[PDB]
């Protein structure tokens, strides 16, 4: 029923008289009932990684043996809720304790059981109807944006013997009650699910729809997709500065789950202050991002066990909202801090490490976390397709590319927005290094582009070719000299400068460049590549001819055209509507064609 | 309160470096405090690092020399280390264990606070947006500090990091559009360094507002494990209870990490990098993360650790983890120190992660962020041009490359360079930055918006 503490060493308690305890089962250690997890068994003695400070835990202290593993309460109240790494509600703790401190062993319910929720059952349901895991048997009007579809827990099934009528219910009220094999199971609106178990789905479908970040470089050169899997450096200036809040403010995603695995104190404070104040335009109204975002905060000084469970809690919440039928963009602030937690716990366990001290199962754990992403035909009879798009941040020691966690990540993730330290130093934001950064979803996105942006794929191909040619030419230019360059080489270099400075360079703090629509991105790239092709055509055609044309001639003739192409990035979608921006870009193309016709 | 008589054990079973392993212990309490009376009456203190049934691995702060089994009396206080804290701790000097060394009386406790500290709910932690006008241009201009922020001073052996810290201490103050109370924690600082800091505080008159915790080099090497926690508990008392804007200086997190490594090696734990404990990240975070403000309160705890990077290596575990935790770093450069620049702050590798929200209109000025960004960019390009010149020669440099080199020279001569007793307001720092940026034409200042170039460049 309950064991006794035999020894203590930091977070690693060792409790005796735990004969039947199960691995990874939950226990409450001490007289304050500190949450712990059984990570090892030796006869009748269980090693317990404790999720709170173990100071003052004495040998012989009772150890309650709870039968469940680390699990999260999934139900109404998640949206707009700030959570500790193990689902403890920080805001509710503050309100209940009336103090700024997290009391040790605090046991406040993750989901409030006093808030009345507007519950409306699925009308077609009735007493005796057959239901299974995933069946949306009711909807809670959580807020103006998210309709919380109350799903029957996975691995549940049977005949509905009672469905509550429409009304207002608590998170603890028995709302449904179904019989199977003669056993009656009573279900409220909150379901407990282990954080380390993948939520089942009918089928993981391929990802074939872009997840539009705000950045032109990421959207065009290295696309991401819904249900995707991305690695993004945690370098300053980029990352939390712009990309996370842009995904929050606007994207194809319908929910956001942001897990601060190892966040610094004041930076986590920055997130918790900014996010409740961000707003987005939905159905002609400005609504708080908190109405569809949830935060799983975990500062660096919180227990390492909670730091390890933070990622799992976040991904389980994301999977729940995916099963709901939504697109959940999840952002892990640092999987590097998760790996550090794993390394420290492995050391405390006295396991043999792999290279650089990390456990040899770091890659397996990273895969078990990432591969929980994807676009899925959610379980449950009412057909729906959800997705979970993970954006995990990796911050190796001193920008190391051979870092074990970065290598394990690159072995799993399909998108990687590598960091250019040179660009970061020059203050070229985003600092993506387009030469080693990659996205494997380009092939899957061919169908989407060839139906909505038919012309964008050749533009992307030509832009990448131009950038690589610039990379190859800059070495020669700075090794030897700029005098021997051909006219076509000059076109490539100057078009590469144009693209890099005014298509791949996006300042995320300006009103006009906070979020760049993909129509804007594709139109800009189209203008730039059209200019490239036409200038190269002029140069090559006039080569071996009396009236030779050169890059200097072109620039001197149409410095105005170059300036307009440079200022193209300033179009503001908010006031310069889509039609206005497209018309302006078409006018720029017309001016380019007219000027080159005059030149020719 | 604990009324039960304490238990005294003459059952010492083993001494191994700083560890004293007792047996036959009645219900050992982890992290409990013990008082070891040696055979000759010398009294020491220890902390139970781990317990296993009837065993207890005490860790003696003063060192285990002179201890013998069968005669050392370890009295178990029955409670975790609860340091006494009082406002009159300001203007006092304490050794690493908190005992007076200024010939004053023992601290008359206003309260007894756990040294490990009370974790702070992130939901009620204020984001520090108030700038600290340190008066050092290399920091204010480009790596500004926000009140409540954690920002270490990475340096090496022989660099003037003590001088920079003393300058920051004596010049720290808010930007003019509440004086700081200093809590000092010296770990392994030689007598010269400790005397320098104490004399500086006395000369500048802040001693009434300064609370020192000195653990010199000759002092026990395991006492610096608790010294920073004592300092931060006192800082939390003065800030979140007495409503004082505190500034916490920690001289040698390198020495603290060496103490951690020593204890871990004595414990024969599975090592991390370079032999440091695998939990060094968490141990360092439990110290750094105690800065910042909180809702309802009026005080704050600005934290400025100081590190000695071994072999000037910013990839060493101590600086690496301290960067992972703290919000930025101020980097002291051996090349600059050799070239006789002061402060030798290399602004390329150093950053401040709260500077973006500390600077700007209303806080300091409209052009602060753009000026800093352009200064950093021009400095980096100048360093690259210098590296190229070292190989190809100046005669192959273009006019713009020569402009970058001139900017680098004047930037290290006018912006970074600064008298030890000279505090430049943020506005003066920005004026110097603009004078240096005017070297380049407006067309070469790419990171400065035209709306600000047309307002500040022409002057």
């Amino acid at each position: 029923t309950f064991g006794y503490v035999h020894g203590v060493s930091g977070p690693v308690v060792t409790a005796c008289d735990m004969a039947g305890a199960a691995m990874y089962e939950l226990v409450r250690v001490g007289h304050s009932e500190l949450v712990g997890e059984i990570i090892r068994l030796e006869g009748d003695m269980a090693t317990i990684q404790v999720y709170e400070e173990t100071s003052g835990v004495s040998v012989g202290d009772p150890v309650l043996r709870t039968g469940k593993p680390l699990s999260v309460e999934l139900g109404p109240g998640i949206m707009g809720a700030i959570f500790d790494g193990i689902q403890r509600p920080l805001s509710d703790i503050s309100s209940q304790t009336q103090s700024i401190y997290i009391p040790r062993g605090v046991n406040v319910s993750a989901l409030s059981r006093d808030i009345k929720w507007e519950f409306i059952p699925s009308k077609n349901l009735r007493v005796g109807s057959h239901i299974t895991g995933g069946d949306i048997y009711g909807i809670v009007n959580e807020n103006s944006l998210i309709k919380h579809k109350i799903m029957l827990p996975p691995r549940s099934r049977g005949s509905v013997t009672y469905i509550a009528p429409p009304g207002n219910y608590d998170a603890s009220d028995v709302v449904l009650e179904l019989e199977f094999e003669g056993v009656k199971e009573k279900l409220s609106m909150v379901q407990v699910w282990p954080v380390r178990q993948v939520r089942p789905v009918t089928e993981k479908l391929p990802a074939n729809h872009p997840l539009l970040t705000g950045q032109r470089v990421l959207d065009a050169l290295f696309p991401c997709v819904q249900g995707g899997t991305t690695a993004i450096p945690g370098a300053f200036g980029c990352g939390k500065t712009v990309i996370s809040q842009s995904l929050s403010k606007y994207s194809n995603s319908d929910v956001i789950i942001y897990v601060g695995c190892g966040e610094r104190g004041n930076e986590m404070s920055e997130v918790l202050r900014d996010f409740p104040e961000l707003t987005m335009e939905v159905d002609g109204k400005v609504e708080s991002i908190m109405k569809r975002t949830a935060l799983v905060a975990n500062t660096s000084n919180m227990p390492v066990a909670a730091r390890e469970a933070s990622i799992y809690t976040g991904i389980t919440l994301s999977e729940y909202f995916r099963d709901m039928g939504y697109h959940v963009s999840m952002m892990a602030d640092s999987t590097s801090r998760w790996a550090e937690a794993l390394r420290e716990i492995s050391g405390r366990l006295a396991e043999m490490p792999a290279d650089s001290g990390y456990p040899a199962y770091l890659g397996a754990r990273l895969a078990s976390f990432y591969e929980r992403a994807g676009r899925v035909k959610c379980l449950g009879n009412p057909e729906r397709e959800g997705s979970v798009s993970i954006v995990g941040a990796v911050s190796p020691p001193g920008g190391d590319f051979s870092d074990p966690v970065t290598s394990a990540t690159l072995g799993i993730v399909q998108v990687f927005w590598g960091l250019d330290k040179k660009l970061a130093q020059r203050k070229h934001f985003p600092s993506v290094n387009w030469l080693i950064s990659y996205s494997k979803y380009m092939r899957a996105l061919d169908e989407y582009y060839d139906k909505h942006f038919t012309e964008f794929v050749p533009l992307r191909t030509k832009a990448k070719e131009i950038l690589q040619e610039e990379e190859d030419l800059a070495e020669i230019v700075q090794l030897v000299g700029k005098a021997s360059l051909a006219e076509t080489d000059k076109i490539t270099l100057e078009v590469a400068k144009l693209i890099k400075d005014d298509f791949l360079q996006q300042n995320g703090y300006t009103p006009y460049d906070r979020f760049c629509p993909f129509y804007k991105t594709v139109g800009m790239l189209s203008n730039m590549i059209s200019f490239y092709d036409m200038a190269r055509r002029a140069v090559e055609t006039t080569a071996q001819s009396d009236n030779k044309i050169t890059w200097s001639i072109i620039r001197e003739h149409m410095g105005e055209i170059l300036y307009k192409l440079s200022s193209m990035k300033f179009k503001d979608p908010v006031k310069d509507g889509e039609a206005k921006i497209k018309a302006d870009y078409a006018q720029l193309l017309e001016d380019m064609q007219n000027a080159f016709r005059s030149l020719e | 309160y604990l009324s039960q008589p304490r238990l005294t054990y003459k059952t010492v079973s083993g001494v191994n470096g700083p560890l004293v392993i007792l047996d036959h212990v009645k219900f050992p309490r982890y992290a409990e405090i013990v008082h070891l009376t040696l055979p000759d009456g010398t009294k020491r203190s220890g902390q139970v690092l781990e317990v296993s049934g009837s065993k207890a691995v005490v860790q003696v702060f003063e060192g285990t020399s002179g201890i013998d089994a069968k005669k050392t009396s370890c009295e178990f206080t029955g409670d975790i280390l609860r340091t006494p804290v009082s406002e009159d701790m300001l203007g006092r000097v304490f050794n690493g264990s908190g005992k007076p060394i200024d010939r004053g009386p023992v601290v008359l406790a206003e309260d007894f606070l756990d040294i490990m500290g009370q974790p702070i709910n992130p939901q009620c932690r204020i984001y520090p947006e108030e700038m600290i006008q340190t008066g050092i241009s290399a920091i204010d201009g480009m790596n500004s500090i926000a009140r409540g922020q954690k920002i270490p001073i990475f340096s090496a052996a022989g660099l003037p990091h003590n001088e920079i810290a003393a300058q920051i201490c004596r010049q720290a103050g808010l930007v003019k559009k509440e004086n700081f109370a200093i809590v000092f924690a010296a770990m392994g600082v030689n007598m010269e360094t400790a005397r320098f800091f104490k004399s500086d505080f006395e000369e500048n008159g802040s001693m009434d507002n300064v609370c020192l915790f000195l653990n010199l080099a000759n002092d026990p090497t395991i006492e610096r494990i608790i010294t920073p926690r004592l300092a931060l508990t006192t800082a939390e008392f003065l800030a979140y209870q007495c409503e004082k804007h505190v500034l916490v200086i920690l001289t040698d997190m390198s020495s603290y990490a060496e103490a951690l490594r020593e204890v871990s090696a004595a414990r024969e734990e599975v090592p991390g990098r370079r032999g440091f404990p695998g939990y060094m990240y968490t141990d360092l975070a439990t110290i750094y993360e105690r800065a910042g403000r909180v809702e309802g309160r009026n005080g704050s705890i600005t934290q400025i650790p100081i590190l000695t990077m071994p072999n000037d290596d910013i990839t060493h575990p101590i600086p690496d983890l301290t960067g992972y935790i703290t919000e930025g770093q101020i980097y002291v450069d051996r090349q600059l120190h050799n070239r006789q620049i002061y402060p030798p702050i290399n602004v390329l590798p150093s950053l401040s992660r709260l500077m973006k929200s500390a600077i700007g209109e209303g806080m300091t000025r409209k052009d602060h962020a753009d000026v800093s960004n352009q200064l950093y960019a021009c400095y980096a390009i100048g360093k690259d041009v210098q590296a190229m010149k070292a190989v190809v020669g100046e005669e192959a440099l273009t006019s713009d490359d020569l402009l970058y080199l001139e900017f680098l020279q004047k930037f290290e001569k006018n912006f970074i360079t600064q008298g030890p007793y000279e505090n430049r307001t943020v506005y003066e720092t920005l004026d110097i930055g603009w004078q240096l940026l005017r070297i380049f034409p407006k067309e070469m200042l790419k990171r400065i918006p035209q709306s600000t170039l047309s307002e500040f460049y022409p002057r």
Binding site: P353 | E268, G275
Partner: peptide
Amino acid sequence: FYRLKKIQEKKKIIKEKSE
């Protein structure tokens, strides 16, 4: 490698002590 080998030897010795 030396540190890990030393740790393995100590773990073996501790296991023998417990046995």
